[PDB]
Design an enzyme around this catalytic site. Structure first.
Site, mmCIF file in Angstrom:
data_model
loop_
_atom_site.group_PDB
_atom_site.id
_atom_site.type_symbol
_atom_site.label_atom_id
_atom_site.label_comp_id
_atom_site.label_asym_id
_atom_site.label_seq_id
_atom_site.Cartn_x
_atom_site.Cartn_y
_atom_site.Cartn_z
ATOM 1 N N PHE A 64 0.832 -1.199 0.000
ATOM 2 C CA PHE A 64 0.000 0.000 0.000
ATOM 3 C C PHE A 64 0.865 1.246 0.000
ATOM 4 O O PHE A 64 1.770 1.388 0.827
ATOM 5 C CB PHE A 64 -0.984 -0.005 1.179
ATOM 6 C CG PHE A 64 -2.081 -1.027 1.044
ATOM 7 C CD1 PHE A 64 -1.807 -2.389 1.148
ATOM 8 C CD2 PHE A 64 -3.392 -0.629 0.817
ATOM 9 C CE1 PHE A 64 -2.820 -3.333 1.027
ATOM 10 C CE2 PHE A 64 -4.407 -1.570 0.686
ATOM 11 C CZ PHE A 64 -4.119 -2.921 0.790
ATOM 12 N N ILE A 66 -0.115 4.947 0.036
ATOM 13 C CA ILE A 66 -1.168 5.952 0.159
ATOM 14 C C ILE A 66 -0.529 7.275 0.570
ATOM 15 O O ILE A 66 0.365 7.304 1.421
ATOM 16 C CB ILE A 66 -2.236 5.510 1.200
ATOM 17 C CG1 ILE A 66 -2.792 4.112 0.882
ATOM 18 C CG2 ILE A 66 -3.366 6.526 1.326
ATOM 19 C CD1 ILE A 66 -3.485 3.978 -0.452
ATOM 20 N N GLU A 246 -2.160 -4.771 13.458
ATOM 21 C CA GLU A 246 -1.185 -5.684 14.069
ATOM 22 C C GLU A 246 -1.736 -6.397 15.298
ATOM 23 O O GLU A 246 -1.439 -7.572 15.520
ATOM 24 C CB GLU A 246 0.097 -4.941 14.434
ATOM 25 C CG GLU A 246 1.190 -5.816 15.030
ATOM 26 C CD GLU A 246 2.489 -5.060 15.180
ATOM 27 O OE1 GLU A 246 2.693 -4.415 16.234
ATOM 28 O OE2 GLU A 246 3.307 -5.112 14.237
ATOM 29 N N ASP A 269 15.051 -3.665 11.533
ATOM 30 C CA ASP A 269 15.399 -2.253 11.498
ATOM 31 C C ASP A 269 16.808 -2.126 12.060
ATOM 32 O O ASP A 269 17.003 -2.210 13.275
ATOM 33 C CB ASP A 269 14.416 -1.419 12.325
ATOM 34 C CG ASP A 269 14.694 0.083 12.234
ATOM 35 O OD1 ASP A 269 15.872 0.474 12.084
ATOM 36 O OD2 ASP A 269 13.731 0.875 12.317
#
Ligand SMILES: O=C(NC[C@H]1O[C@@H](n2ccc(=O)[nH]c2=O)[C@H](O)[C@@H]1O)c1cccc(CO[C@@H]2O[C@H](CO)[C@H](O)[C@H](O)[C@@H]2O)n1
Ligand SMILES: O=C(NC[C@H]1O[C@@H](n2ccc(=O)[nH]c2=O)[C@H](O)[C@@H]1O)c1cccc(CO[C@@H]2O[C@H](CO)[C@H](O)[C@H](O)[C@@H]2O)n1
Ligand SMILES: CCCCCCCCO[C@@H]1O[C@H](CO)[C@H](O)[C@H](O)[C@H]1O[C@@H]1O[C@@H](C)[C@@H](O)[C@@H](O)[C@@H]1O
Ligand SMILES: CCCCCCCCO[C@@H]1O[C@H](CO)[C@H](O)[C@H](O)[C@H]1O[C@@H]1O[C@@H](C)[C@@H](O)[C@@H](O)[C@@H]1O
Ligand SMILES: [Mn+2]
Ligand SMILES: [Mn+2]
Lengths: 289, 289
Positions: A64, A66, A246, A269
């Site tokens: 996605f 957006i 989540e 990360d």
């Protein structure tokens, strides 16, 4: 297709599996319900590639983009081209409110991309959550006829290493990079009993990341439908789960055990967490903010 | 049935899986094609029992008792009653040339036994081999309508400990107790290229025992059909594989990888091999001669 008649593997020459040698001595490689946990060293990719190519497997990848997140598409798609299911049929599905802002990325043979225009919600939370509704709606439409498996990921990421058919299974979740070593009491599950996502402190196997899940089209449709319906109940009751989609993903995977679990190699990360010894590869990682 | 819509698991309280602790440090618990290798300590039986009961799973157990081997039935069935799939629907299929010599064993609720009269071959090798033809013939008949999974075992054995739903999967083989620690060159595969069972010395994952295999009805039908057809080709070419049906089983499982592999806990001979530290349980064992 899946569960179809499968022809014989060809002669292959590879190292014999060692019954009396663990493939990993530092990590859990199988869940208590006998689902593989996918780490480097657990799989021979040559064997798996053979098995999946012989079935002419097609993998759909949903993403996605957006509003401002369209900026992440170029790197996402370019790196997917170098690392994601290379050698197999791939169909990218880019959901966006700005079809004109989708970058023209050069694709390898047998790989295609479809732009799916959708509405943009105001709150980032709703944009994130409504992915469940949008994935479910397109399952009963395009996905069933076009792909065998669906992989559903965040866009603000890049591939840095192999992500291939080792992940494919009826239903998978991914260990969240922030919590793989945490006790269940410390998991940031939804803890209010008023929410459909509620998990008590004495329940839970893992904390799965909302940024990377998937499975067969049928199982992904089921998961996304269930999460969307649970979110609609919550909205009707004036409650929003602590970590949105989540939280609901975690409730679903507690009650419907995944058939594979991906290690944090697949969702990382490096800026926040470095590069631990336990990770032999960093495959799919956050883009520095 | 299998692959059917599955309802949610109930709330359960059990120890949290430990991501940073291997479940076994002494053995391989997953194959290189990501199939679980089933050892004690790899599974939580409470979770698995829930999953399989919710699907109302029925397990068929096939056993051949031809000529003098009818003598083994009483102990086989009595011990199966105490250890095999207790709590689940079980259908025993006893193939015999002497229906009148089948002992009247008392069965627990939800468990049944059918006597299937078959011809007795003269050579013990043919009796052993023709199990493949007989299992395949009854698959396309009774098994498809009556059971979800088939487990195919030798009769001159007894159950000594739990054998349950942890073994169930589309296709499984069992590590032969004599060779789990051997290198592939030492495996007693068929080594003559003139035989359909031929495996070169640089190929092979494991040496599977002919005494314990199974899977879904569809996958067992496929395996048994393939082994029988390969044995018919061999017979036409005037060759008989070194270890008969077991040789063909090994060729089949090399070319069609099993989705679970059972450890030697599930196929043992204590008289010949003792009780190694690597075996926390002895589940299914040879009867002293
Ligand atoms: O990743 C985030 N949201 C989940 C996904 O939801 C989609 N999203 C979210 C908000 C948005 O405005 N546009 C989007 O496309 C993107 O695919 C995102 O990867 C997210 C949300 C807030 C803050 C951050 C910072 O990292 N990420
Ligand atoms: O187990 C053997 N044969 C495989 C199976 O094949 C079936 N069989 C074999 C020969 C036979 O005469 N009757 C049988 O019923 C039995 O179910 C056996 O368990 C076998 C064969 C030769 C010698 C020994 C000694 O152990 N076992
Ligand atoms: C005891 C150690 C506590 C330290 C744990 C640090 C990881 C926190 O992680 C956040 O976890 C949340 C759930 O509780 C959400 O999944 C959120 O999306 C995620 O942040 C995302 O993923 C992260 C990896 C980062 O990339 C962050 O920028 C993202 O927004
Ligand atoms: C280097 C160590 C070499 C020592 C290995 C000792 C195990 C030998 O095993 C035999 O193996 C054959 C294949 O090569 C056949 O499967 C045969 O049925 C089996 O004997 C059967 O199973 C055995 C476990 C015994 O119960 C025996 O009485 C049975 O006839
Ligand atoms: Mn993000
Ligand atoms: Mn025997």
């Amino acid at each position: 297709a899946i569960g179809e008649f499968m022809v014989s593997l060809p002669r292959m020459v590879y190292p014999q599996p060692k019954v009396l040698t663990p493939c990993r001595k530092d990590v859990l490689v199988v869940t208590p319900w006998l689902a593989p946990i996918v780490w480097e060293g657990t799989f021979n990719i040559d064997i798996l590639n053979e098995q999946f190519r012989l079935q002419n497997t097609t993998i759909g990848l949903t993403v996605f983009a957006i509003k401002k997140y369209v900026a992440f598409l170029k790197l996402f798609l370019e790196t997917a081209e170098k690392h994601f299911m290379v050698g197999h049929r791939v169909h990218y599905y880019v959901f966006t409110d700005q079809p004109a802002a989708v970058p023209r990325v050069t694709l390898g043979t047998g790989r295609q991309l479809s732009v799916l225009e959708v509405r943009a919600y105001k709150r980032w939370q709703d944009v994130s959550m409504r992915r469940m509704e949008m994935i479910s709606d397109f399952c009963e439409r395009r996905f069933l006829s076009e792909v065998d498996y669906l992989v559903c990921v965040d866009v603000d990421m890049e591939f840095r290493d192999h992500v291939g058919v080792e992940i494919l299974t009826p239903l998978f979740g991914t260990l969240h990079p922030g919590f793989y070593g945490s006790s269940r009491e410390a998991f940031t599950y939804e803890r209010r009993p008023q929410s459909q996502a509620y998990i008590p402190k004495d329940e839970g196997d893992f904390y799965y990341g909302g940024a990377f899940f998937g499975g067969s089209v049928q199982e992904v449709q089921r998961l996304t439908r269930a999460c969307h319906q649970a979110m609609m109940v919550d909205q009707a009751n004036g409650i929003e789960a602590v970590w949105h989609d989540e939280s609901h993903l975690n409730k679903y995977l507690l009650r419907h055990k995944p058939t594979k679990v991906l290690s944090p190699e697949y969702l990382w990360d490096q800026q926040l967490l470095g590069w631990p010894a336990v990770l032999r590869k960093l495959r799919f990682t956050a883009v520095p903010k």
